[PDB]
């Protein structure tokens, strides 16, 4: 029953092709939530989560971080594109900011109540957007390979942070994770780390099955628990 | 509204003075939850949490771990009493098992659905009780100084574990917490760690006010968030 529509946004050097979802039957301004997808691109997994957020009463924008709606399917083809973003965090943040712009342009979005969630690379994207100083009230990352802190970002995260983490995730090792947590603690960010034992990468995606590589596996419990923790953080900051 | 009654229990060595709290508006067998208090003794803070569990539909037993209902207020005498349990974990576990016995003796308790929570030393007590092999479906610790693992306990934890942890807690430092998590991971315990940035010991007790010592401070958010996580875990295992 959720109103679902394509949205093209961004400045023309290849436009982003995303999805906007909201509960048509609700009225007035509502919180908006960005959904940043896994590295491959905007897939049904990300769109379905945007639909769940709409059912929770939010205006959700499932973002395209590649341009043109491109969804990679091999790591050899994906590798150039993702390494380019890792090496150019200014461009990476600009792409995320373009999604925020498009969300803020919706008539139904409360500009003072905007948050972001992200899966894998999308969770890293949320943190990059927050580090740029964007006015996110909250952000939640799910099995994300978070990037190292940069001095120039000190003090720029104004929202709350929830990191949902598989304790055995090989793409977010303890030393790198502790360095991120030390940035957040230094700047007195309200952060929470929810770590799951026996859980690794991609734990929210049912397509991460036994055919996948070691360290990439769906976990139904972690999926449900992390979603519940995100729902509780949003209830907090959107009250 | 909650039915609240003193209960004296034990099997010889000492006689414990606890509180049994339940919603007597509900019929049939109900899940039971042990509440182990802070090191001082069975105080109002612990009884109040047992009351809240009763309101959730559980039969709650707020445990006395010293005997006689004694509540210490001087560190010069409480210290030795706690360290004596630290050095005799068999005795420590027997006192916790006496509480479990008294909970299971209630006509209204579903002995297939029993859990335990604890604050500070009480959270350490929950983990000792589970390591003994007690049939706890779940346990949740709140700012607990958990004790190091014993090989004899390998594989004896049959329930789910949620550890709610102030990242700055001086009584539970990273190296020692990692050793506990290594035990749980080795035995494939379904465990979760919920860590709070900028939060330390005693974060659930408002009595840990500004007059206290460093590293002991109430945090309203961590209090609410950890309680909500515990609620979600019990909703899981008691379904």
Task: Give the position of tokens 């929950």.
Answer: B126
Tokens of B172: 């539970």
Q: Does B239 touch chain A (CB under 8 A)?
A: no
- DSSP label at A152? G
The distance in angstroms from the start CA to the end CA of chain B is 24
The closest of B118, B146, B142 to B199, measured between CA atoms, is B142
The closest of B216, B196, B199, B220 to B208, measured between CA atoms, is B216
Strands A191-196 and B191-196: antiparallel
Rounded CA separation B48/B12 (Å): 28
3-state secondary structure of B27: coil
Sign of the C-alpha dihedral, residues A206, A210, A216, A219? positive
Supply angle C-alpha A151, A156, A157, rounded to 5: 115
Strands A3-9 and A16-22: antiparallel
Rounded CA separation A138/A148 (Å): 20
Q: Does B188 touch chain A (CB under 8 A)?
A: yes
Calculate the CA dihedral of residues A104, A105, A106, A109 and round it to 10 degrees.
30
- DSSP label at A151? G
DSSP H or E segment with residue B180: helix B174-186
Residue of A188, A221, A236 lying closest to B198 (CB–CB) = A188
Residue B108, CB half-sphere, CA atoms under 13 Å: how many? 20
CB A12 within 8 Å of CB A43:
no
- DSSP label at B39? T
Task: Search chain B and give the residue with CA nearest A161.
Answer: B197
Calculate the CA dihedral of residues B56, B195, A144, A224 and round it to 10 degrees.
-10
Show Cβ contacts of residue A105 under 8 Å, excluding neighbours closer than 6 positions: A9
Tokens of A221: 């419990």
Tokens of A46: 């990300």
Overall resolution, Å: 1.9
CB B173 within 8 Å of CB B141:
no
Does the distance separating the beta carbons of B197 and A192 come in below 8 Å?
Answer: yes
Residue A20, CB half-sphere, CA atoms under 13 Å: how many? 20
Task: Give the position of tokens 């010293």.
Answer: B66
Residue of B168, B184, B221 lying closest to A197 (CB–CB) = B184
Residue A233 β-bridge partners: none
Task: Give the position of tokens 């995606």.
Answer: A205
DSSP state letters, B136-179:
-SEEEEES--PPPP-GGGTT---SEEEEEEETT-TTS-HHHHHH
Calculate the CA dihedral of residues B122, B126, B131, B137 and round it to 10 degrees.
180
CB B128 within 8 Å of CB B137:
no
DSSP H or E segment with residue A192: strand A191-196
Show Cβ contacts of residue A99 under 8 Å, excluding neighbours closer than 6 positions: A9, A16, A18, A34, A36, A61, A63, A64, A65
Shortest distance, CA B229 to any CA of chain A (angstroms): 8
A with B: how many residue pairs have Cβ under 8 Å apart? 61
- DSSP label at B106? S
Strands B3-9 and B16-22: antiparallel
Shortest distance, CA B19 to any CA of chain A (angstroms): 31
Sign of the C-alpha dihedral, residues B228, B231, B236, B239? negative
Q: Does B192 touch chain A (CB under 8 A)?
A: yes
Please count the helices (runs of H) and the strands (runs of E) in chain A. 6, 8
Rounded CA separation A164/B139 (Å): 20
Q: Which domain holds residue B154?
A: 1-239
Cβ-count burial A40-72 (b if 16+ within 10 Å, e if not): bbbbebbbebbbebbebebbbbbbbbbbebbeb
Rounded CA separation A46/A118 (Å): 9
Residue A17 has phi, psi (to 5 degrees) of -115, 105
Total domains in chain A come to 1
DSSP strand E in chain B: where?
3-9, 16-22, 30-36, 59-62, 109-119, 138-142, 160-166, 191-196
DSSP state letters, A6-52:
EEEES-SSS-EEEEEEE-TT--S-EEEEEEE--TT-S-HHHHHHHHH
Q: Is B69 exposed, middle or buried (0-12, 13-18, 19+ CB in 10 A)?
A: middle
Length of chain B (residues): 239
């Amino acid at each position: 029953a959720m109103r679902k529509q394509k949205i093209e946004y961004g400045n023309g050097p290849t436009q982003f092709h995303g999805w906007l979802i909201r509960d048509d039957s609700l009225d007035g301004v509502r919180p908006g939530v960005l959904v940043f997808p896994e590295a491959y691109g905007l897939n049904e997994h990300a769109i379905e989560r945007a639909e769940r957020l709409a059912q929770l009463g939010y205006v959700a924008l499932a973002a395209d971080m590649h341009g043109g709606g491109v969804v990679y399917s091999d790591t050899a083809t994906l590798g150039p594109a993702i390494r380019s973003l890792f090496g150019d965090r200014a461009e990476w943040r600009a792409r995320a900011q373009a999604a925020l712009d498009a969300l803020l342009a919706q008539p139904q979005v409360d500009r003072d109540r905007v948050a972001a969630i992200g899966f894998c690379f999308g969770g890293a994207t949320c943190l990059e957007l927050a580090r740029s100083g964007a006015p996110l009230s909250a952000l939640v990352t799910f099995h994300a390979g978070l990037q190292p802190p940069l001095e120039a970002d000190a003090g720029r995260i104004t929202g709350k942070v929830l990191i949902c983490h598989g304790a055995e995730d090989p793409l977010m090792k303890p030393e790198a994770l502790n360095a991120v947590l030390a940035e957040l603690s230094r700047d007195r960010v309200d952060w929470q780390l929810l770590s799951f034992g026996g859980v690794a990468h991609s734990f929210t995606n049912p397509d991460a099955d036994a055919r996948g590589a070691p360290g990439f596996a769906y976990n139904a419990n972690a999926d449900r628990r992390s979603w519940a923790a995100m729902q509780g953080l949003f209830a907090e900051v959107f009250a």
